[PDB]
Amino acid sequence: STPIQQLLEHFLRQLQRKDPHGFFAFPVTDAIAPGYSMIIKHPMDFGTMKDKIVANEYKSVTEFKADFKLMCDNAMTYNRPDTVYYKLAKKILHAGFKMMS
Template sequence: MMKLLMAVDKRDKFRFFTSPVTDQMAPNYSKIIKQPMDLSTMKSKVERGLYDTWADLQADIVLMFTNAKTYNAPATMVHKQADALLTGGLKMVRNFKQGKTKLRGFTGAWRQRCRCSSV
C-alpha cells in the first residue's frame, strides 16, 4: 500500500495533495470539506496498520481527490490534476489488488489527461 501511495505522491507534481489543507491555504475549506484527506494522512494510516483492505485505501484516495474537485472549480489546475490522479490512482489500485506492482506506463497516460504545464 505504501508503494502505491508513494507512486501517487510522485505524480502529484504540484504537491497539491501532499499534506493537509488548511483554511489559510484555502479559505473556508473546513466549512466546505467535512472529511479532509491527504497523502501524508494516508501514509500514516498505512504505517499504523489502519487499512484492512485495498477497498479501505481506495475509499480514502477517492475521498482526497473528490474533496479537491468539490472545493476547486473545474478550470483550475488542482481540479484537473485531481481528476487525472483519481483516474490513474484507481487503475493502480486495481492492478495492485491483482498483484501487478510494476508502475511503468502510468506516467504518460496521466500526463496526457492532466496536460498541466504550470500552476
C-alpha cells in the same frame, strides 16, 4: 510491516509520483483555502494516508482506495473545474484507480 502495509506503501509511492508539486502531500488549511473546513467534512491528503499505513489503520485495499477517492473528490468539490487542483485531482483519481487495477 504486514503484507497490506507493504502493498499500500507501494501504491502510495506510485500515486505521489503523479503529484510532483506535492499539491496533495499535506492537509489543506483554512488559512490558504478560505472556508475549506466548512465545505469539506472529511479532509484527506497523502501525508495522512502515509500515517494511516504506518499506524496499520487500513485493513483492506478498498479502505485505502476510499481515502484516495475522498482526497480527489474533496479537491473537485471545493475547487472550480478550470483550476490546477481540480484538473490534477480528476487525472490522478482515474490514473490511480487504473494503476491499483
